[PDB]
Amino acid sequence: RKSDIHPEFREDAKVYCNGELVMTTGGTQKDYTVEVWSGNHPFY
Amino acid sequence: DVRVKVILECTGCVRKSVNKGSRGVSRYITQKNRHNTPSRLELRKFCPYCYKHTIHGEIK
Amino acid sequence: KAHTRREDRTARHVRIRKKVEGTPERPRLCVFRSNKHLYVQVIDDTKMHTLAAASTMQKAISENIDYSAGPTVEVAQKIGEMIAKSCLEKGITKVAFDRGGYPYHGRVKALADAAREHGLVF
Amino acid sequence: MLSPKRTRFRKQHRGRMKGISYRGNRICFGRYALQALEPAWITSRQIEAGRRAMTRNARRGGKIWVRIFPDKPVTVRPAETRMGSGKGSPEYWVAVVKPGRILYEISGVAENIARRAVAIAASKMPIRTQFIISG
Amino acid sequence: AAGTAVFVDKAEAETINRLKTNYIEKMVPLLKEEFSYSNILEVPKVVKIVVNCGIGDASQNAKGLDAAINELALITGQRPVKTKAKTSIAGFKVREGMTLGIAVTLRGNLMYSFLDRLINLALPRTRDFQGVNPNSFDGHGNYSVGFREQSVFPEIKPEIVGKARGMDVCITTTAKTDKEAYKLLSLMGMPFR
Amino acid sequence: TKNGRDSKGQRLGVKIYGDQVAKPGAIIIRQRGTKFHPGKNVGIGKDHTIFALIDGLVKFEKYGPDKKKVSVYPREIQPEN
RNA sequence: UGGCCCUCGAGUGCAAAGGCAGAAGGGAGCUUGACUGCAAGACCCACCCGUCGAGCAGGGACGAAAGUCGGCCUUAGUGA
RNA sequence: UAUUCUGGUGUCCUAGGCGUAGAGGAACCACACCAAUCCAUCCCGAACUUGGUGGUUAAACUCUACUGCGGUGACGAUACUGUAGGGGAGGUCCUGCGGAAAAAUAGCUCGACGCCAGGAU
Ligand SMILES: [Mg+2]
Ligand SMILES: [Mg+2]
Ligand SMILES: [Mg+2]
Ligand SMILES: [Mg+2]
Ligand SMILES: [Mg+2]
Ligand SMILES: [Mg+2]
Ligand SMILES: [Mg+2]
Ligand SMILES: [Mg+2]
Ligand SMILES: [Mg+2]
Ligand SMILES: [Mg+2]
Ligand SMILES: [Mg+2]
Ligand SMILES: [Mg+2]
Ligand SMILES: [Mg+2]
Ligand SMILES: [Mg+2]
Ligand SMILES: [Mg+2]
Ligand SMILES: [Mg+2]
Ligand SMILES: [Mg+2]
Ligand SMILES: [Mg+2]
Ligand SMILES: [Mg+2]
Ligand SMILES: [Mg+2]
Ligand SMILES: [Mg+2]
Ligand SMILES: [Mg+2]
Ligand SMILES: [Mg+2]
Ligand SMILES: [Mg+2]
Ligand SMILES: [Mg+2]
Ligand SMILES: [Mg+2]
Ligand SMILES: [Zn+2]
């Protein structure tokens, strides 16, 4: 990645789901508040 | 019309009749498109008198 | 259209080789760089002859310098020196540099600089 | 009436007609055929009339192929027009045939009806011809 | 009702491990065995994922372009490329060099991370979801899926979004056949049909 | 509409042939595009005029596989009969 | 936007012709050789014109260097 | 001095190309994996760059084989023609001496030759 031109990619993103679930992912934010996601979704 | 004969001239040439071996005022001639580029053309070009590549501007 | 690294670099080598031509008075200095080895050659194209060739596969640099995986700038400098001496000992001074498809930079550049400090003219 | 749908230049060299046509020689579609014996220029009108005649006389017999076609333009200057001021107007279209060339092919009759039919066809042609049978 | 996302929610997890190490630990032995290949390197790998926004009206107003660029950025952690139209096109009112769409390519690790945030975050948080089409393969084992609107990702803050803007996503893979690519995607947690 | 305009034949084409003799500077070929390509001992011009750098016999060759190139070689004229 | 197959069928300011595919076609970086002084020899030729040019010196541009550069892929764009 | 093999590097050419099947990992060539101060992407360490790992012949390249495609290609004869004539109202035909295709088939083709380094005999 070239410097200063990219939005900072924060490597540590903790996924906090309202089932008091905490995982790790990555994305520009440090934490992601999630009520609806892959596991615990209407289908399967 | 929109395309023109323009005269390039040495900026460092002194018309006064200089004391060196070869006296005279270098001018080149060339064409410019007066619409596209309104900037007075500047060009580094050789001057037979000064013997060095000088800078030649334009004339009105 | 070749996107294999191999064929690509070959393409570049040929393109470069359009302009730079080995002559009796100006032999071509030919650089080959592979993953584990640095190999350099000197060619007169009229006579179709290699005059001098230095490589990492010779005992000189083997006993001098060892490296782990990729040839280092150090390695290259050593080679440039070896070919400088080898060629200066056959009466070959004035040569032309064939960068063989690799951008002039890194160990290629360093090779060149080595062979320049040591009396070879290019 | 047969004719090309397009060309760039309108007007074209008279050309010259020499030799034998080697390629149109064979009879590859039907059974009986009418073969050109002499080097000539066939207008599309003539081919029309020949085909028409052979078709009407065969009638109850089936099939007629026309192995030629008028693709080369031909030009004419009007009456009381002094020579000069440009090449004239293309009036009609010709097909160039050389000796040996097959013109008409025919199938679906006894040899007699075919002979009669092909004779009446040959009557509307500018050229001498021949009756030939498939090999 | 076959669930491969019980493999993706299974325990409290880490990123790099999830994608890159579920690939090397789990995915590869599986594919090795079920297709029976005669060397390791014949395993299908994810090569690159390019995301492409298609908006031609944005060439009229460059602020929309800048906005959409920063949006795609915050989504993907990458400041995009603005793709120019090659030819003069009448019916769409475009001349040469006009900035048409917006495109990014995600390679290496960022490819895996964005793939994760796709399957396990935005795809469920989408509008009424059923499963993605198994038939969207190109025949050489490269997959493509559309996104009608970008409210899917949390980085995109829905109230600050001016207008809904669409995105396309192309997964590119060393797979030569669709079966292998399909097993790869679904094994990695993808919601099919 | 109305025709009758045309141009003087430009005098193009091979000036010296195969196994003939050429001075230095002597023009071998005046061509429009390059129907021939410069070989050895031979310069090419702005209009793709091909000219000699050396006294000697001019020889045409197969550039390969399709095109053609011209080059000049020095001869030896000892055999005075 | 992604990919497989055909391989020169696109392009080249503008006619047509001849050229040109790791290119003479598309892009990027730095520029002003779109120089002064010249020139062996050639082509074309009624004359007048017209065209090609190795090589030499000066002072430069690009390039790590070898080297390339006296406008433009060529042929129209002119007036004693 | 030979020979064999790998990698580099060229010249000649009938331009040796695609396909199918097979061989190569000690060495050599390659990819594979990992990390990014020299440099690098109009976005992306993909490419190009510097530094490591030690995995694999999968791709690549390499070497052997084969007419399925592709490429090449006769002898003869014919068309055409140079010169000397002849026939026809003409379009155009014919003869003698000399030159001689194209196409098509029969065959041919899975290149030739050289220098350098490095092993092996
Ligand atoms: Mg390496
Ligand atoms: Mg005859
Ligand atoms: Mg009659
Ligand atoms: Mg003419
Ligand atoms: Mg020049
Ligand atoms: Mg044109
Ligand atoms: Mg053309
Ligand atoms: Mg170019
Ligand atoms: Mg010169
Ligand atoms: Mg010189
Ligand atoms: Mg000079
Ligand atoms: Mg410098
Ligand atoms: Mg140019
Ligand atoms: Mg052959
Ligand atoms: Mg052969
Ligand atoms: Mg293999
Ligand atoms: Mg065959
Ligand atoms: Mg064949
Ligand atoms: Mg014969
Ligand atoms: Mg005769
Ligand atoms: Mg006669
Ligand atoms: Mg004869
Ligand atoms: Mg004979
Ligand atoms: Mg012949
Ligand atoms: Mg033949
Ligand atoms: Mg062989
Ligand atoms: Zn001055």
Q: DSSP of chain E, one letter per residue? A: ---SSTTTSSSS--HHIIIIIHIIIIIHHHHHHHHT-SSGGGS--EEEEEEEE--SGGGT-HHHHHHHHHHHHHHHTS--B-PBP-S-BTTTTB-TT-B--EEEEEEHHHHHHHHHHIIIIITTTSSS---B-TT-B-SSS-EEEEES-STTSTTS-TTT--S---EEEEEEES-SSHHHHHHHHHHTT--B-
Q: Return the SS3 of D87.
A: coil
Pairing mode of beta strands D89-97, E46-53: unpaired
C15 C-alpha to ligand 8 centroid (Å): 13
- Asked if residues C87 and C30 have their Cβ atoms less than 8 Å apart, the reply is no
By CB atoms closer than 10 A (0-12, 13-18, 19+), residue C91 is exposed
Range of the domain at D89: 22-135
The pair phi, psi for residue B15, each rounded to 5°, is: -70, -10
A touches E (3+ CB pairs < 8 Å)?
yes
In the sheet that D63-66 helps form, which strands lie side by side, from edge to edge?
D63-66, D102-107, D32-36, D129-133
Number of other CB atoms surrounding residue A17 within 10 Å: 17
* Cross-chain Cβ contact E6/A39 below 8 Å: yes
Residue labelled with tokens 């001992």: F41
Q: Which two tokens stand for residue E118?
A: 């796709």
- Asked if residues A7 and E73 have their Cβ atoms less than 8 Å apart, the reply is yes
CB of E164 less than 8 A from some CB of A: no
Give the whole-angstrom CA distance, residue D93 versus residue D99: 20
Neighbours of chain A (3+ CB pairs under 8 A): E
Q: CA of F53 vs C1' of G79, distance in Å?
A: 37
Range of the domain at B47: 1-60
Resolution in A: 3.2
* Strand positions, DSSP E, D8-101: 32-36, 40-43, 63-66, 72-76, 89-97
In the sheet that B3-10 helps form, which strands lie side by side, from edge to edge?
B27-33, B3-10, B53-58, B43-46
Give the whole-angstrom CA distance, residue C121 versus residue C118: 9
Give the whole-angstrom CA distance, residue C82 versus residue C57: 13
- Asked if residues D40 and D95 have their Cβ atoms less than 8 Å apart, the reply is no
What is the sign of the dihedral through the CA atoms of D59, D62, D68 and D69? positive
CA A39 and chain centroid, separation:
14
Number of residues in chain E: 193
Q: Which amino acid is at E28?
A: V
Q: For strand G, which residues in window 55-74 of chain F come within 7 Å by CB?
A: 67
C34 C-alpha to ligand 1 centroid (Å): 8
Q: CA of E76 vs C1' of H40, distance in Å?
A: 22
Residue labelled with tokens 């660029």: E69
G41: residue with closest CA to C1': F25
Give the whole-angstrom CA distance, residue D66 versus residue D50: 10
Q: Which two tokens stand for residue E107?
A: 């390679």
Q: CA of C56 vs C1' of H120, distance in Å?
A: 20
Q: Please give the angle made by the CA atoms of E75, E76 and E82, to the nearest 5 degrees.
A: 100
CB of E158 less than 8 A from some CB of A: no
Q: Nearest Cα to C92, choosing from C40, C19, C23?
A: C23
Residue A4 is given by DSSP the state T
Q: Nearest Cα to F28, choosing from F42, F47, F46?
A: F42
CA distances C66 to B57, C117, D36, E165, F38, Å, are 61, 23, 90, 57, 48
Q: Could you tell me the residue ranges of all domains in chain C? A: 19-122
B10 bridge partner residues: B56
The chain E residue lying nearest A7, using CA atoms, is E77
Contacts of E117 in chain A (CB under 8 A): 25-27
Question: What radius of gyration, in Å, describes the C-alpha atoms of chain C?
Answer: 14
C29 bridge partner residues: C42, C97
Across the interface, of E9, E15, E79, the residue whose CB is closest to A6 is E79
Q: Report the number of distinct structural domains present in chain D.
A: 1
Residue D7 falls within a domain, yes or no? no
Q: Return the SS3 of C71.
A: coil
- Asked if residues D120 and D104 have their Cβ atoms less than 8 Å apart, the reply is no
Cα-Cα-Cα-Cα torsion D23, D29, D33, D34, nearest 10 degrees, comes to -50
Options 3.30.160.250, 3.10.20.340, 3.30.300.30, 3.30.420.100; CATH for C19-122 is 3.30.420.100
What lies within 8 Å, CB to CB, of E131 at 6+ separation is A43, E191, E192, E193
Give the whole-angstrom CA distance, residue E2 versus residue E14: 24
**Helix D111-122 × helix D44-58 angle, to 10°:** 150
* Cross-chain Cβ contact E78/A7 below 8 Å: yes
CB of E131 less than 8 A from some CB of A: yes
Q: Which two tokens stand for residue E19?
A: 């994608």
CB of E185 less than 8 A from some CB of A: no
Q: Which amino acid is at E156?
A: I
In the sheet that F50-52 helps form, which strands lie side by side, from edge to edge?
F13-14, F27-30, F50-52, F42-44
By CB atoms closer than 10 A (0-12, 13-18, 19+), residue D59 is exposed
Rama region for A7: left / alpha / beta (φ>0; ψ in -120 to 50; rest): beta
Find the helix or strand (DSSP H, E) in which C73 lies: helix C73-88
F67 C-alpha to ligand 17 centroid (Å): 25
Give per-residue burial for C19-45: e unless 16+ CB within 10 Å, then b.
ebebeeebbbbbbebeeeebbbbbbbe
Give the whole-angstrom CA distance, residue C117 versus residue C115: 6
Q: Report the number of distinct structural domains present in chain B.
A: 1
Q: Return the SS3 of C115.
A: helix
E109 CA: nearest nucleotide by C1': H44
The pair phi, psi for residue F70, each rounded to 5°, is: -115, 140
Residue D72 falls within a domain, yes or no? yes
Across the interface, of A6, A13, A34, the residue whose CB is closest to E78 is A6
Give the whole-angstrom CA distance, residue A40 versus residue E177: 32
Give the whole-angstrom CA distance, residue A28 versus residue C43: 56
Range of the domain at A4: 1-44
- Asked if residues E155 and A9 have their Cβ atoms less than 8 Å apart, the reply is no
Number of other CB atoms surrounding residue C14 within 10 Å: 10
Residue D80 is given by DSSP the state T
Q: Which amino acid is at E52?
A: N
Across the interface, of E5, E119, E125, the residue whose CB is closest to A36 is E125
**Technique that determined the structure:** cryo-EM
Helix segments in chain D, DSSP class H: 44-58, 111-122
Among A10, A33, A37, A40, the residue to mutate for chain E (most E Cβ within 10 A): A37
What is the sign of the dihedral through the CA atoms of C16, C21, C22 and C25? negative
Cis peptide before F65 (omega within 30 of 0): yes
CATH code at E68?
A: 3.30.1440.10
Contacts of E191 in chain A (CB under 8 A): 43
Give the whole-angstrom CA distance, residue A26 versus residue A29: 8
CB of A3 less than 8 A from some CB of E: no
Give the whole-angstrom CA distance, residue D33 versus residue A36: 84
Is there contact between E138 and strand G, defined as CB under 7 Å from any strand atom?
Answer: yes
Across the interface, of E74, E117, E119, the residue whose CB is closest to A7 is E74
CA F45 and chain centroid, separation:
11
Among A14, A25, A34, the residue to mutate for chain E (most E Cβ within 10 A): A25
Q: Nearest Cα to F19, choosing from F11, F6, F7, F28?
A: F28
**How many beta-carbon pairs below 8 A join chains A and E?**
91
Residue labelled with tokens 């039919």: D117
Q: Report the number of distinct structural domains present in chain A.
A: 1
Question: What radius of gyration, in Å, describes the C-alpha atoms of chain B?
Answer: 13
Pairing mode of beta strands C38-44, C49-55: antiparallel
Across the interface, of A5, A37, A42, the residue whose CB is closest to E121 is A37
Give the whole-angstrom CA distance, residue E26 versus residue C9: 37
Q: CA of B47 vs C1' of G40, distance in Å?
A: 29
- Asked if residues D104 and D67 have their Cβ atoms less than 8 Å apart, the reply is yes
Give the whole-angstrom CA distance, residue E50 versus residue E81: 11
* Cross-chain Cβ contact A25/E117 below 8 Å: yes
Contacts of E116 in chain A (CB under 8 A): 25-26
CATH code at D42?
A: 3.90.1170.10
Q: CA of C68 vs C1' of G66, distance in Å?
A: 34
Q: For strand G, which residues in window 53-92 of chain C come within 7 Å by CB?
A: none
Question: What radius of gyration, in Å, describes the C-alpha atoms of chain F?
Answer: 16
Contacts of A34 in chain E (CB under 8 A): 121, 125, 154
Range of the domain at E27: 1-193
Measure in Å the smallest separation between the Cα of A30 and chain E Cα atoms.
Answer: 11
Give the whole-angstrom CA distance, residue D51 versus residue C107: 84
CATH code at B46?
A: 2.20.28.120
Give per-residue burial for E74-92: e unless 16+ CB within 10 Å, then b.
bbbbbbbebeebeeeeeee
Q: Which two tokens stand for residue E32?
A: 């090795």
